[PDB]
Symmetry: C6
Subunit: 189 residues, 6 copies
Amino acid sequence: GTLQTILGGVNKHSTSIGKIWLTVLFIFRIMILVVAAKEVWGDEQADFVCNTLQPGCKNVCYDHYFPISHIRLWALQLIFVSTPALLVAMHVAYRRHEKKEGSLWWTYTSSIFFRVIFEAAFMYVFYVMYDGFSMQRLVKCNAWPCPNTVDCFVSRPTEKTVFTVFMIAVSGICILLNVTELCYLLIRY
Amino acid sequence: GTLQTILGGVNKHSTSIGKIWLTVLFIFRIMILVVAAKEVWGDEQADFVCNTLQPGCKNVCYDHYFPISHIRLWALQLIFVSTPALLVAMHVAYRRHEKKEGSLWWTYTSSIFFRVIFEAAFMYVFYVMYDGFSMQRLVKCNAWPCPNTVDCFVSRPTEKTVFTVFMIAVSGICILLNVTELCYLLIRY
Amino acid sequence: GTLQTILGGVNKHSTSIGKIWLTVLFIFRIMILVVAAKEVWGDEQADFVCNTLQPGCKNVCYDHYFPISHIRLWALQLIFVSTPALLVAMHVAYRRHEKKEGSLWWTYTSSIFFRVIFEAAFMYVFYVMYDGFSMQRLVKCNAWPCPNTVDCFVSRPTEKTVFTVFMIAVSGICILLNVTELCYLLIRY
Amino acid sequence: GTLQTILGGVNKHSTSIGKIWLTVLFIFRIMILVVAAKEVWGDEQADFVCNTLQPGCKNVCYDHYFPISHIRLWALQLIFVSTPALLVAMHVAYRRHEKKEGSLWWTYTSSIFFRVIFEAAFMYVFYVMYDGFSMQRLVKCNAWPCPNTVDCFVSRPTEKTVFTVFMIAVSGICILLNVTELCYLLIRY
Amino acid sequence: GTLQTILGGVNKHSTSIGKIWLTVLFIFRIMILVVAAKEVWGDEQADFVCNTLQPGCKNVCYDHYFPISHIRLWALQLIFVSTPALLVAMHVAYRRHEKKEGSLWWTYTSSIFFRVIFEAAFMYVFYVMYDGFSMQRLVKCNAWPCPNTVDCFVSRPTEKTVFTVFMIAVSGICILLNVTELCYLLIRY
Amino acid sequence: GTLQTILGGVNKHSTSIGKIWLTVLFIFRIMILVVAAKEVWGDEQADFVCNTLQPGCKNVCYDHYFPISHIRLWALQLIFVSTPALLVAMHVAYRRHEKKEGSLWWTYTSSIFFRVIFEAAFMYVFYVMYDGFSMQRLVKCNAWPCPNTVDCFVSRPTEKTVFTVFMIAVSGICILLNVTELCYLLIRY
């Protein structure tokens, strides 16, 4: 509800690319995460099935191959890339209150520099942690107390792959948009 | 709550067909998806039953025949066909802010051109992926590790067929309405 | 929340019967569906029990006797009978905006004509599909793959019957109120 | 949210007893039903246990002894006793709109007459249907297909009894308050 | 949402202790009950485990030792201690409306007298019903149909004890604050 | 919704560090707890698995090693560290109402002194209760009625460790920010 009012405040005090394309893509990712993707991961552990009679083997194998869920990583990423925009708004509101270019410049050019770092950091984590963007149907697990190697089966691997590729692609576009914003301000000096 | 306020803003700045019929049908599809259809697909995997003792065969057979759920496809389709309208609103708000036909024409005629493409694209995906709009009671699955061929049974196939035909028919009507909007602007030049 | 504001807008621009009795009964049906009836049908398939060892027989028997749930039919009916009122509101708002009897007459008399058709259509569907308004405790099912004939037992048949009779009776009253509205406008010509 | 605004409108246009005590007790019953009582009846059928191996005996015994749940009866009762107050508000709003004692008297004295009837009707139903206000731990069921007589056990019988006595007592107080309101208007003539 | 607006209205028309400390502690208890304590009691019966093969013994033993849940008692207590404040607000609003010390005194001094009674009554009930504020891991049950004496095990006894002590301590503080409010008005006469 | 309005009121009447960094980190912790961390702990007891046939051993072992859940501790911590800010707001509103440095100084310097105490207290509790910030896959339990020593396995130990380190680190930063706020006011005297 009030989030729409927040967007209008953040909509102002930005450049053409920043006003429209960055904000639309940011809302785009939130909608995908909230209304569509969150129920795909609902039964991630409930429907995780292992071919064994060993008690506790299912708990350790799921924890080994999914140290942190994909949706939790995306939730953290959206929070981190949204804070520098929120910090600017409070700084401007604080600045206006005390009133009744250089300071504005350095705050703005720093905020879009942190967003690029955060986007690239989480994008790198997704790759190393899950060795690619495709989820497998079968995982082989040999952690204690599983005897030898145990076959375990993931829930909805194909649908999770579709949303993973979707979220990564949009994040890559947001990186390019922020990079161009730097170039526009770089040549203007 | 605030979504109603959003509709009023989008209600304005449109033509007779665009103001009323496109917006009503768009709200029509959202209501069907939210209040009625979403709980039909709630137990899609929980009540998926296969006649086998092989561990993991249920996971791979459901994933094979339902790579992405119908409700997730409709959620993606509604988001895509709604973005060009949202892009116009921010462009107009940006245009009005800087103020204090050709630009308006090209943005408007392009937005309704993207909606036709997105509607047809998702409509085509529904056909090829699910080979028609009727869901079967029985699916035969022979993917590893299922031994030979295994019979599996879908949950609520008839009710899902009813809502599938309903959503496809409304999407087809929206395509025709957008096509006529092009014709009205085509003859006017 | 905002739905209350919507009602006030729809409350105006109507006749004495239309202003009060039709709108109150419409809110009456929504309240019954939302706060009371929706949790009666919550375990419709989970608590559906069949006396058999055949895998998949439960899925096909429930689908055979309940092609579409009662609550989904009522949700569709309320949406259909509410659209003509919503179409009038946008037409009036569009008409007022362009400003700054015959047109108003034909739109109004048509809207209450569609409501009668939609109410009677869904009322007819409830009868033919479920052969009466009483739900049985026992259903006998012989669809493949059930061997011979299998006894299956419905969940909460009596409570569902009570709400079915309640919703049908209110719909019948709404039909009569709309018919009288036609008679008042018929004699006035 | 907006319900609080609704109360303020209904708070006005009433007498001293009607303004305060009837409205407070009405909010009192809603709070008990919503925040406290509704989760007591959550597992009414899930935790209903019968001592038998007969398939379907649990479904028919629960349906026999609980034709309609207590919380659904209270939800219906609150809706019925609230409509005459809502009808008056629309009548007054309609009356004021056309402007820009006898009519007001008959509408008001009729509304509080319907509330007494509805309160007594539902109170009578609670008694005959459930033969008293105390819920038993054990119910004996001999309906088909249960063999002979089967023992079944109710979930949370004591807590449900506490809330049943609570709701009945408050309803009895509301009857007395409405009766006195008639007496005050009866002597005044 | 609107509850915050309600607090502002109740915040005014009170004394220094009443304006701040009573209202803060009242909000304090609601937050504990809503956001923290309510999910502790979620599986109170689902995870209640008894060492027996007797059908129905689990139902009767849980009902015997938990006639009413702790969270339901706290929900009732908060509603009761909040009504006298709500009654004053409607009385003042009614008084102001008819306008366009003694009456105000007696209403105010009575309201804080009922709050002390309600706080002490529920505090006494918690003690006698549950014989102290510590919940045990093991309960021994011999009610029919349990054979002899059966061992049953409570879910999350330690966490429930922590929140029980927390709620009792805050209630005790609220009693003292109300008592001092009487003393301040007693000496002033 | 209204929480955003609350933040704006709390945003004012603070110092540079207090206005921005403390409030942003406070919102930061709430977002992590609400949208991300709360569903990690959803199946804490449901997926807790012990290698035994002893009834009731699972209940006592979970209760022994998790006397209070991590998310409940964080919920309590956020409530405690937020009350002194809320107390100041009501004091200022009360002060302004009666109007129509020393008092303001002592209230402000005390509020940030309580926040440091509460942050350190809960941080200490997390350490002693859970002997570090890393959660183990395996816990060995010998409480009655478990025979000898029983192996039990925790659900999602790695993901819970990640969020535990995250919440502790942010709390440590908030302690440092409050300490510096004291130093700024200490030198100014």
